[PDB]
């Protein structure tokens, strides 16, 4: 049952996180998506295959005997994210008081990302289970050179009253609209330490 979800996520990654796809590859991956939805079935399926037929009026003479389908390898770079500042390995944590904000400067480079101003977000996880999805503003994605972009931003860490020093999770996410989120950076755990105010 989860193998269908894995198919879906791999197709998502091949679609969005990659650069230089042609219409042929789109045909192939949408066919894989149709297979995934048909197999996770075991009403909406008919409307979605109708939409597929409407948007793919040209590929029908090219999808003969479909639901193996050849995948041409075009000419390609896998985008990635390198969270740098801060490292979090420092035993020196970040101090905060008995209920207040605290600032966290995220400084991370991205390589060969397709227009990161839209499809990138930062995700914050408290050990409880909530999730903050901070969309970054436009003017915080610097542009140092071809295929390389820089993201320096501020993230606001706090919550209800905290008793003991703990860890928090900050990572990147690729947001896509076909509505979904793809994790593609190694998360960074930051240590936060309390000190009630004076």
């Amino acid at each position: 049952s989860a193998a269908a979800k894995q198919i879906m996520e791999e197709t998502y990654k091949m679609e969005f996180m990659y650069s230089g796809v042609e219409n042929k590859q789109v045909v192939i991956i949408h066919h894989m998506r149709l297979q995934a939805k048909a197999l996770q079935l075991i009403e909406k399926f008919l409307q979605e295959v109708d939409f597929f037929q409407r948007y793919f009026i040209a590929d029908l003479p090219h999808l003969q005997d479909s639901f193996f389908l050849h995948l041409p390898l075009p000419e390609i770079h896998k985008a990635s994210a390198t969270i740098i500042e801060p490292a979090g390995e420092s035993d020196n944590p970040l101090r905060f008081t008995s209920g207040l904000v605290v600032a966290l400067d995220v400084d991370a480079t991205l390589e060969h990302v397709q227009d990161p101003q839209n499809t990138v977000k930062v995700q914050v996880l408290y050990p409880d289970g909530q999730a903050q999805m901070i969309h970054p503003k436009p003017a915080d994605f610097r542009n140092p050179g071809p295929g390389r972009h820089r993201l320096i931003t501020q993230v606001y860490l706090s919550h209800t009253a905290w008793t003991e020093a703990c860890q928090v999770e900050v990572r990147l996410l690729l947001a896509y609209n076909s509505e979904g989120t793809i994790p593609f950076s190694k998360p960074v755990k930051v240590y936060i330490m309390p000190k009630p105010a004076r």
Partner: peptide
């Protein structure tokens, strides 16, 4: 701004 320096002068 409330974040940074301010959180070290908070006296109620």
């Amino acid at each position: 701004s409330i974040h940074g320096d301010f959180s070290n002068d908070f006296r109620q």
